[PDB]
C-alpha cells in the first residue's frame, strides 16, 4: 500500500491555468446535451436575498468562476461580474404551466451554469441548468447545494474557509500521483485484466432522455441497509450486484463491463469543501460467479472492492488503453451506475429550498444511467436512459424486474428465498401472457396412419388426379393400387413394423407409389438422393439397416448398392402383384420416415407428428380438392414430406416437375402455367428465380398461384411484393423449422412488409408446437432479448436420431422450467411485442523492434517466447519489474526510453511504435533492431 | 537568373560530421551490389612506386579518406593508415587466367576502394573496386584516374592545391542553395511540370548487369559532332534523342521520362579538383514533339535545355515529390543516360596506365544506363543492363537499332534521308524474318460456292449421316433435299443475289436445312437469337432490310415479328415445294451470312472467305467423314459458322445438342458418348464444364474426343491437361479471331503446357491471314512490343458493316507500310520469338484543414474553386505566390507557417497534414478550422 506524496498549495498561481481533469477532458471533445437541469417549486421567492446568495456563492467558490480557454485549459476569473439571474414574469398568462413546459450552454463562456426565476400566480419556478463539465455529482449536491440552501437563509452565513484550490488538487493528481509508486502498482493491476475485461452490456437495440424511478422510504431503506450488511455488502454493492442479475436478463452475453464512478478526494485536508470534478469511473467486470443470486452478488461485490482499492489510476485511461486495443466502439462503457452513498453528510439539502419538479441529466456517451442518492432520510433510485438507445419496453421491462428484485430481498430473510434462488425469472407481467398465449396450441391429433388417410381420401374420390408427373396422370384409384401392389409385395418379402425402407428415385409417381407401399406394409421410408457421390447410398443404407431398397429401373444401373440388398423397381417388378386392400399393423407413434442431415444424422419422424402438420395446413390455408401442389423439393429433404402427405389426404393434385440437377425457372413457370399450380412450396431462392422468369413474359404465367410457401433461408425483402404482382391474391407465408421439428413448425403470414424492417419475421407455432427463447440455462428470456430457439412438442418432434441415443439426449433436452421435451434448434432469435420471432441468425522497421522489445520482455519475464501483441503486464510483469524493463532497453538500444515509455504501452508493439516515433531514441532504436 | 550565394569554406571542421548529398542518401538506403570495377593489364607494374601513389592520392584528396558513420552522416578519416593493396601471385598457376576469373566493401570501413594487384607470366592486372557512394563518374575519370596517372609516374609530382573540401561543397549546396531564392524559382518550375511527368520506359520485361557496347573513332565521332551541330545540339542531346527514338520502338507508351544525370560543380573556384558526388539526376520528359527525327529530337533537346537551367533543384527531390504522389514504384526512374561529354579536359588518362581488360557498373535501382565517354580520341558508346530486367533479344535488338539510326545520322546529310523520315522501323533482322516466314501464308481459295460444296458432298455420299438432332437423323440426300425445297420456293417469292433471310430458330436441323436453303436460293442467311428480348428481332430485321425469316412451327407464337414480314416455318411451310436442284446465282465474294456483334454492327462475310476457313482446317486437323462434330455454338454467334460448313463440307457428322438456355455438361457429356463425338468446339468454360462433368463419372464418356478447339476467352492452365485425362489422345487447339475475321483466324495447338507461362500463347495465322502488331501509327512492332493485334487479308476478312461505310472504314484500315486491308480488333498482344502471339488483354481534422488550405490558396490565385489535392504550384502558384501563401496561412490560422513548409508541400492536402502535424502550430490550426 504505497503512500502518496503530499499536496502542497500554490495560490500564487491561483488565476494561471491548469488541465482538465481526465473526466473534463472527456465531456470536452465528447460534446463536440451535455447538462444537468433542476426546477424546484416554492410559494414566495425573495429575490433580493436569491441574487445576494448567488453573489457570495460564486464569490466564495473558485469552481463556480471556472471557465475552458479556447485551448482547453481552464482557469479561475476573478471578478467575472454579476451574476446573471433571468425573471421571467407569467403571473398573468393563463395556462402558464404550459407556457414555462414549452421553453425546453457553453464551457468557453462565464457561467458555466444558467439562473432563471418564474413568477406564477401563488408560486415561483427556480431553475437552475448546469454544465457537466463544471463540478461533478457529489460536489453539486455536497458543496453547492448546501451552501445555496445555508446563505439563501442568510447571504452572510459563516462558511468554511477554502484551505485549497480545486486547481491545486487536480496539478497534484496529474503530477504527483500520476506516474508516482502506487499509480503505478495500480496500473499494473489493471493492465493485468484488461484483455479479459467483457464489453459493456450488450443490451437490444431498437429501429433525448427518459427516467423510471421509485423512493425507498426511511424503513425500507434500512431494511435494505440490513439484507445488505447480513451478506457483508455495502447498500451500493447490493444494489450494483441486483443490477446486473437484471441486466442478465435481457443481455447478449452474460458477462459485461459496468461503469460504477467513484468520487475520491483522497483525504486531501479542506478538500471535502472544495467545488470541483472528483469523478474517478472505475470499470467493473461482471462475470456471474455463484450458483445463486445472494453467492452472486457477493461475489462481484468483492470484485469491485479489489478494483476500488486500485482506483488511484482513473478510469478514463483503462477507458483509453481499452480503445487502443479493441477501438473506441468496442470500448465505449455507456451503462452507468452512481451512487452518492457513503459520501459524508451535507450540512443542508435542496429539498429544505424547494419542493423538486423537474430534473434530467443529459449525459453524452450515456444510455443508461442508474443513479443511487440518499434524499431527505429516503433512497432514490432512479434510471435515466436514452430514447432510441433499446428496443421499446426493455427499459421499462429491466425497470419493473429490479423493483420485483430488490422487494424480494427486502421480503426475505437472508438464507432463504431469493436470496438462494438459482436465478430470478425476468420476464415481465406482459411478456408472460403475450407468449402464453401464442404458445396455447394443444390439438388432439387422431390415431389415423398416414396412409390410412391416404386410401381413405382414394375410396372418396377415386378418379380425381393424384399425382400429374411428366405426361402421365396417374388417378387416386391408380395411385392406391399400386402402393397396395408395393405393400403387399413389401409384406410378403418380410417388411415388419420398424423396418426402413431405402427409395432411392428421381422426382417421378414412383416416388409416391414407393412411400404408401412402404407405410402400407408397414415400414418407414428412408429416402436417399440418386445424385449422391461415391458409395453415399451405400454407406447411408449400411448405416441405417435398411435392408431392401425401391428405385426406378430406368436409374437402376448407376448405383452402388451392395450385393446382399433387394433392390425393387416400383415401375416393373410389382406388376403382377396383389391390390388386395392391406391392413395396417404399425402404430401412429411409429416411424414414417428416416431423414438424413448434415457424420450424417437420421431423424426418424413419426405419423402422429406428421399428421399434426398436415391437419394444421388445411385449416390455415383453406386446402382443397381443388388445390394443386408443385412438388419441387427432392424427397430426401424435409420439405418434400408435406408435399407427399398434405395434398393427397384431402385430395387434392401433386404436380411433379421433371427431374432437375440446376434451377429451371422457365420450365417451372411454364409447368404453373399449364397445370394450374395453386400452391408453391420451395426455399426463398427457387421462388425469386421464378419470380424473374415471369416479369420478363408476357402472359402471367404464375397467375394461379394461390399460396406460396417459402422457408430455409432469409426472404428477400422484396420477393412477397414481386410476386404478388405476377400472381394477384397470393398468399406469400414465411415458414421455418429443421428436420426434427417435422418440415414446417411455424408460420408468418406476409400480408405487407414494413420497410423499417432489417427482415421479415419469422412467425408464430403451428398446432403443438411452442417456440421458446432460451438463455444458456435454456431459461426462457423477456421480449427481445436474443437467445436460442427451442421448439417444445410432444409429438411434433422427431422420435429422436437413429441408433443415436447420445446426441438424441443432447438436443432434445427436458426444458428445466416445465419439463417439456423441447429440441435445440441452434438457431437465435428474439421475442416480439406481438408474440412473434424475428430470426438473428441460422444454424517493418518497427516489426523488428517489436520483436526485439518481445525477446527482450520474454528473458526478463523467464518466458521461452512472447507475442508483439501482448500486453506486458498481463504476460506476466508487475510494477517493479516494468521498471527493470525500460532499463533493459535503454540498454540493449543505446537510447532512452523513459519508465513513462513502457507504462504508457503495455502493449509490446505499441511500445515499438512508441520508441521508433520517438525522435530522441527513434533512428538508434531502428539501427539496432535491424541487428 | 537570381544569383546564388557564394561558398565560404570552413577548415575548422574539416574532420567534422556532415550530411550525405541527396544521391549518396539514395545509395545509401538503396543498397539495404552497388560498387564499380576496374581491371586494367600491363606488362610490368613497379609495386613500390604504385603503393607510393596511392599513399599520396589518399593523402592528398580527402574523399578518398570519407567513411559513413553508423547514424547515416559521414566524415573525413585525418590518418587512416597504409592502404591495403592485396598482391596474388600466379605466375606459377597454368590456366591462371580461369584461376583469376573466378574470383568475382561497404561505406561504413575505410577505404571504400578495394586494391589489387594479380602477378601473371608476363603481364600484370590491376584491379580497382570502388564504391558508388565514394564519388561520382566525373570525379572518377577527371580526378581520380588523372591524378593516378600523374602520381604512378612520378608520386611526388606536383598536384593543383585543394582550395576547399568537399564537405564545404555540400554544406553549402544544402544551406545556402537549397531553400534559396534561385532554389525556390526552379522547384516552382518543376513542381508545375511533375504531376504531367510520364512514367518511366515501360519495356517488354522477362519472365546480374550485362554490356552492350561500341566504341566511335575519332573521324565519326567528329563526323558526328557536326550532325549535332547542324540542328544545333550538343553530341549529348543527339544521342539522347536518338535513344529515345529507339526505346518508342519497345515501350508500351510513347511518352517516358529518363533519368538524365549531370554533373554541376557550379563553378565554385577550385572545385574542378575536388574529389566529391556532384550527381544531379535531371527527370527528362520525352514526349514525341515532332513529325520527323530531327524535329522530335530538336524538341527533346530544347525541354532538356530548359530542364537543365533549373538544376539547382536536385532530381532525387523531385523524385520524392513524385514518389509521394504515385507510390515509390511508380516514381522510380530506372532507365539513365549518363553522359561524361561537355566536361573539362583531364590531364592524364586511365588508357595511359593499362589496357582497360574488364569494367562492370553495378548501379542499384537502375535497368538501363547508356553511359557516354570520350576515350582517348574516339567516343564510347555503352547500354550496361540488368539480366532479367528485359525479355530475351530485347536490349541487344534496341542496340542493334541504335547503331543503325546513329549509323543512319552519320551517313545522311542533314535535311535528308533519315533526319526527314517520319519514323524508323526497328524491327531487327531476325524479327523480320521471323515474322514473314510465320506470316507467308496465301493460299488460292477455289470459286465454289458454299452451298456448292454441301450439294456435291450430298451426290457423293447420299446416304451417310448429316445432321443427327434428338432422336432425328437427317442422311445428306434427306438433308440437301429439304434444302432445295426451302431453294425454290425463296427464289420463287423473289429472293435474288444480295437479300438477306433471317433465321430465328433454336437448336435443330432446321437450321441447317434453312441455311443451305437459303444460299441455294442467291441470298445471305441473317442468324437471330430467338431468345432475344423485347422486339430486338423485329428491330434487327427492320434494320439489316430482311423481309424474308424462316423459323420453326413450334416457335413461331413466342416471336415479335413486324407484319409485313413474310415468316416461313422451315419445318412445314416446304414439304409440298420442289426438290429440283437450284443453280447457283451468286459469286464467291457475294455475302454468305450478316452476323450482329456489340448500336449493333451486321458483319457481313463473303462466301471465299467461309472457304479458306474450311479448307485450313480441314487439312490442318484432317477432318474426315469419320469426324463427329458437337454444334455447341448458336447460330448468331460466329463461332457457329465452322460448325455449318466445315463438316457438312468433307462428308462428316452434325451432331446438334437439344436447345439449352443454360450450360448443362451432363447432357452433353452423354450427348458426346452415346452419338462418339470426335470434333468439340466452344468457349473454353464449356469446354471445363464438360470436363468437370467427366471427372465425377465412372465411364469415359469424352473417350472418342479426338479435336477440341477452345476460342473467345483465355485459356485456363490446366484444362488441357484435365481434357486429355478424360480423353487420350486428344489434341486441344486454342483458337481466336473476332466475327470480322471470319470465326477462326489463328490457332496455337496445346500440345503441352509450360508451367512458367501465364497464358497459353494465342498462336499463328491460318492460311491467307496475316497477324501484325502495330503500334498507335499502324506500324509493326519488334518482338515483345505490346500493340494492337491488326488482321490483314484479302479474302479472310468481312467485307464491312452493313449499311456502315464509315465504321467499315475505321475498322477496315489500310496498312501505311503495305497498302494491305487490315482489321483493327481493339485486342493487344506482343509477338514471341518463335513467331506466335502472346495474347495480353482481349476487348477529417486534417480533411477541414485541406479546404481551409484550398479556399485561401484559390483566394490568393483568383480561381473560383481549387481541390484539396491539387499542386500549389501546377495549380498557378510560382515562387514570390507561395511565398504570400505562408504568410496568409499564418494570418488566417494565428500559428506558425513557415516558407520552407509551403514549398516541402506543394499538394494542398500534403501542407494540411504538415500543418496539423506540426507541434508548434497544430492544434491551433485544427481549431481554426474546425470554424
Same mark, same amino acid.
Given at each position: 500500500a504505497a503512500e502518496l506524496p503530499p499536496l502542497v498549495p500554490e495560490p500564487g498561481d491561483a488565476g494561471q491555468p491548469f488541465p482538465l481533469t481526465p473526466t473534463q477532458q472527456a465531456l470536452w471533445v465528447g460534446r463536440a446535451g451535455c447538462y444537468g437541469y433542476f426546477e424546484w417549486e416554492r410559494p414566495e421567492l425573495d429575490l433580493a436575498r436569491y441574487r445576494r446568495a448567488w453573489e457570495r456563492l460564486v464569490a466564495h467558490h473558485p469552481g463556480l468562476r471556472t471557465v475552458v480557454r479556447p485551448?482547453?485549459?481552464?482557469?479561475?476569473?476573478?471578478?467575472? @461580474?454579476?451574476?446573471?439571474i433571468t425573471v421571467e414574469d407569467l403571473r398573468q398568462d393563463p395556462d402558464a404551466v404550459r407556457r414555462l413546459e414549452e421553453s425546453r450552454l457553453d464551457p468557453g463562456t462565464w457561467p458555466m451554469f444558467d439562473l432563471r426565476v418564474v413568477l406564477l400566480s401563488g408560486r415561483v419556478r427556480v431553475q437552475l441548468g448546469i454544465d457537466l463539465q463544471l463540478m461533478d455529482a457529489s460536489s453539486l449536491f455536497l458543496n453547492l447545494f448546501s451552501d445555496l440552501v445555508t446563505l439563501y437563509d442568510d447571504p452572510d452565513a459563516a462558511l468554511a474557509s477554502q484551505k485549497l484550490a480545486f486547481r491545486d488538487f487536480a496539478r497534484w493528481l496529474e503530477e504527483d500521483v500520476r506516474g508516482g509508486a502506487r499509480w503505478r502498482a495500480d496500473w499494473a493491476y489493471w493492465?493485468?485484466?484488461?484483455?479479459?475485461?467483457?464489453?459493456?452490456?450488450?443490451?437490444?437495440?431498437?429501429?433525448?432522455?427518459?427516467?423510471?424511478?421509485?423512493?425507498?422510504?426511511?424503513?425500507?431503506?434500512?431494511?435494505?441497509?440490513?439484507?445488505?450488511?447480513?451478506? *457483508? &455488502?455495502?447498500?451500493? !454493492?447490493?444494489?450494483?450486484?441486483?443490477?446486473?442479475? +437484471? &441486466?442478465?436478463?435481457?443481455?447478449?452475453?452474460? /458477462?459485461?463491463?459496468?461503469?460504477?464512478?467513484?468520487?475520491?478526494?483522497?483525504?486531501?485536508?479542506? =478538500? !471535502?469543501?472544495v467545488i470541483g470534478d472528483y469523478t474517478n469511473p472505475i470499470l467493473l467486470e461482471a462475470?456471474?460467479?455463484?450458483?445463486?443470486?445472494?453467492?452472486? =452478488?457477493?461475489?462481484?461485490?468483492? $470484485?469491485?472492492? /479489489?478494483?476500488?482499492?486500485?482506483?488511484? +489510476?482513473n478510469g478514463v485511461e483503462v477507458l483509453r488503453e481499452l480503445a487502443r486495443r479493441r477501438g473506441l466502439a468496442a470500448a465505449a462503457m455507456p451503462v452507468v451506475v452512481t451512487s452518492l452513498l457513503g459520501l459524508p453528510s451535507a450540512a443542508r439539502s435542496i429539498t429544505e429550498f424547494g419542493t423538486e419538479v423537474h430534473s434530467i441529466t443529459q449525459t453524452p456517451q450515456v444510455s443508461l444511467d442508474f443513479q443511487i442518492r440518499p434524499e431527505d432520510g429516503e433512497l432514490r433510485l432512479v434510471w435515466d436512459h436514452r430514447? #432510441?438507445?433499446?428496443?421499446? @419496453?426493455?427499459?421499462?421491462?429491466?425497470?419493473?424486474?429490479?423493483?420485483?428484485? +430488490?422487494?424480494?430481498?427486502?421480503?426475505?430473510?437472508?438464507?432463504? @428465498?431469493?436470496?438462494?434462488?438459482?436465478?430470478?425469472?425476468?420476464?415481465?407481467?406482459?411478456?408472460?401472457?403475450?407468449?402464453?398465449?401464442?404458445?396455447?396450441?394443444?390439438?388432439?391429433?387422431?390415431?389415423? &396412419?398416414?396412409?390410412?388417410?391416404?386410401? /381413405?381420401?382414394?375410396?372418396?374420390?377415386?378418379?380425381?388426379?393424384?399425382?400429374?408427373?411428366? %405426361?402421365?396422370?396417374?388417378?387416386?384409384?391408380?395411385?392406391?393400387?399400386? /402402393?397396395?401392389? =408395393? @405393400?403387399?409385395?413389401?409384406?410378403?418379402? *418380410?417388411?415388419?413394423?420398424?423396418?426402413?425402407? %431405402?427409395?432411392?428415385?428421381?422426382?417421378?409417381? !414412383?416416388?409416391?407409389?414407393?412411400?404408401?407401399?412402404?407405410?402400407?406394409? #408397414? %415400414?418407414?421410408?428412408?429416402?436417399?438422393?440418386?445424385?449422391?457421390?461415391?458409395? $453415399? +447410398?451405400?454407406?447411408?443404407?449400411?448405416?441405417?439397416?435398411?435392408?431392401?431398397?425401391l428405385t426406378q429401373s430406368r436409374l437402376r444401373d448407376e448405383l452402388d448398392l451392395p450385393a446382399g440388398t433387394t433392390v425393387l423397381r416400383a415401375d416393373t417388378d410389382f406388376e403382377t402383384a396383389s391390390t388386395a386392400p392391406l391392413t395396417p399393423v404399425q402404430g401412429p407413434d411409429d416411424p414414417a420416415y428416416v431423414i438424413y442431415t448434415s457424420e450424417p444424422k437420421g431423424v426418424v419422424v413419426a405419423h402422429r407428428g406428421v399428421a399434426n402438420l398436415v391437419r394444421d395446413v388445411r385449416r390455415r390455408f383453406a386446402v382443397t380438392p381443388a388445390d394443386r401442389l408443385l412438388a419441387l423439393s427432392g424427397l430426401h429433404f424435409d420439405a418434400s414430406v408435406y408435399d407427399v402427405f398434405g395434398p393427397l389426404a384431402c385430395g387434392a393434385t401433386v404436380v411433379v416437375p421433371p427431374p432437375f440437377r440446376r434451377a429451371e425457372p422457365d420450365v417451372w413457370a411454364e409447368l404453373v402455367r399449364d397445370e394450374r399450380v395453386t400452391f408453391w412450396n420451395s426455399v426463398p431462392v427457387l421462388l425469386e428465380l421464378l419470380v424473374g422468369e415471369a416479369e420478363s413474359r408476357d402472359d402471367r404465367p404464375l397467375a394461379t398461384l394461390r399460396l406460396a410457401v417459402v422457408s430455409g433461408d432469409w426472404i428477400p425483402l422484396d420477393l412477397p411484393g414481386r410476386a404478388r404482382a405476377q400472381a394477384p391474391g397470393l398468399r406469400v407465408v414465411g415458414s421455418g423449422g429443421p428436420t426434427e421439428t417435422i418440415c414446417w413448425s411455424l408460420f408468418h403470414p406476409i400480408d405487407a412488409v414494413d420497410p423499417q424492417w432489417t427482415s421479415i419475421p419469422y412467425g408464430k407455432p403451428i398446432a403443438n408446437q411452442r417456440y421458446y427463447i432460451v438463455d444458456r440455462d435454456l431459461r426462457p428470456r423477456p421480449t427481445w432479448a436474443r437467445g436460442e430457439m427451442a421448439v417444445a412438442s410432444p409429438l411434433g418432434l422427431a422420435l429422436g436420431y437413429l441408433n443415436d441415443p447420445e446426441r438424441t439426449a443432447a438436443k432434445f433436452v427436458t426444458l428445466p422450467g416445465t419439463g417439456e421435451r423441447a429440441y435445440l434448434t441452434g438457431d437465435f432469435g428474439r421475442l416480439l411485442p406481438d408474440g412473434g420471432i424475428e430470426i438473428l441468425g441460422r444454424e517493418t522497421d518497427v516489426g523488428l523492434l517489436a520483436e526485439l522489445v518481445a525477446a527482450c520482455v520474454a528473458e526478463l519475464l523467464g518466458l521461452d517466447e512472447v507475442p508483439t501483441t501482448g500486453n506486458f503486464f498481463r504476460l506476466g510483469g508487475d510494477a517493479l519489474s516494468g521498471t527493470r524493463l525500460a532499463s533493459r532497453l535503454q540498454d540493449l538500444l543505446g537510447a532512452p526510453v523513459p519508465i513513462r515509455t513502457v507504462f504508457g504501452n503495455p502493449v509490446l508493439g505499441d511500445l515499438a511504435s512508441a520508441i521508433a516515433g520517438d525522435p530522441a531514441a527513434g533512428p538508434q532504436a531502428i539501427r539496432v533492431a535491424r541487428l
Open positions: 485551448d482547453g485549459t481552464q482557469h479561475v476569473l476573478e471578478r467575472p @461580474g454579476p451574476v446573471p493492465q493485468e485484466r484488461l484483455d479479459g475485461l467483457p464489453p459493456a452490456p450488450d443490451l437490444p437495440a431498437a429501429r433525448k432522455f427518459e427516467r423510471c424511478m421509485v423512493r425507498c422510504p426511511a424503513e425500507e431503506f434500512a431494511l435494505l441497509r440490513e439484507r445488505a450488511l447480513a451478506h *457483508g &455488502l455495502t447498500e451500493t !454493492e447490493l444494489l450494483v450486484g441486483a443490477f446486473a442479475e +437484471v &441486466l442478465r436478463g435481457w443481455s447478449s452475453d452474460p /458477462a459485461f463491463t459496468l461503469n460504477v464512478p467513484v468520487f475520491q478526494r483522497f483525504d486531501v485536508p479542506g =478538500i !471535502e469543501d462475470r456471474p460467479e455463484g450458483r445463486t443470486v445472494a453467492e452472486r =452478488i457477493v461475489a462481484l461485490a468483492a $470484485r469491485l472492492r /479489489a478494483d476500488t482499492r486500485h482506483a488511484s +489510476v430514447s #432510441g438507445a433499446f428496443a421499446p @419496453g426493455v427499459v421499462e421491462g429491466a425497470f419493473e424486474a429490479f423493483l420485483d428484485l +430488490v422487494g424480494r430481498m427486502l421480503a426475505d430473510e437472508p438464507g432463504h @428465498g431469493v436470496w438462494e434462488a438459482p436465478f430470478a425469472d425476468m420476464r415481465s407481467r406482459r411478456d408472460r401472457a403475450v407468449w402464453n398465449e401464442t404458445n396455447d396450441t394443444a390439438e388432439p391429433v387422431p390415431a389415423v &396412419l398416414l396412409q390410412e388417410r391416404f386410401f /381413405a381420401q382414394a375410396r372418396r374420390t377415386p378418379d380425381a388426379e393424384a399425382v400429374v408427373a411428366s %405426361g402421365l396422370r396417374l388417378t387416386y384409384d391408380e395411385l392406391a393400387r399400386h /402402393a397396395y401392389r =408395393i @405393400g403387399n409385395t413389401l409384406r410378403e418379402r *418380410g417388411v415388419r413394423p420398424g423396418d426402413l425402407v %431405402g427409395v432411392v428415385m428421381e422426382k417421378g409417381w !414412383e416416388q409416391y407409389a414407393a412411400v404408401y407401399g412402404i407405410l402400407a406394409a #408397414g %415400414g418407414a421410408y428412408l429416402p436417399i438422393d440418386a445424385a449422391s457421390p461415391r458409395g $453415399r +447410398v451405400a454407406r447411408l443404407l449400411e448405416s441405417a439397416g435398411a435392408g431392401i431398397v
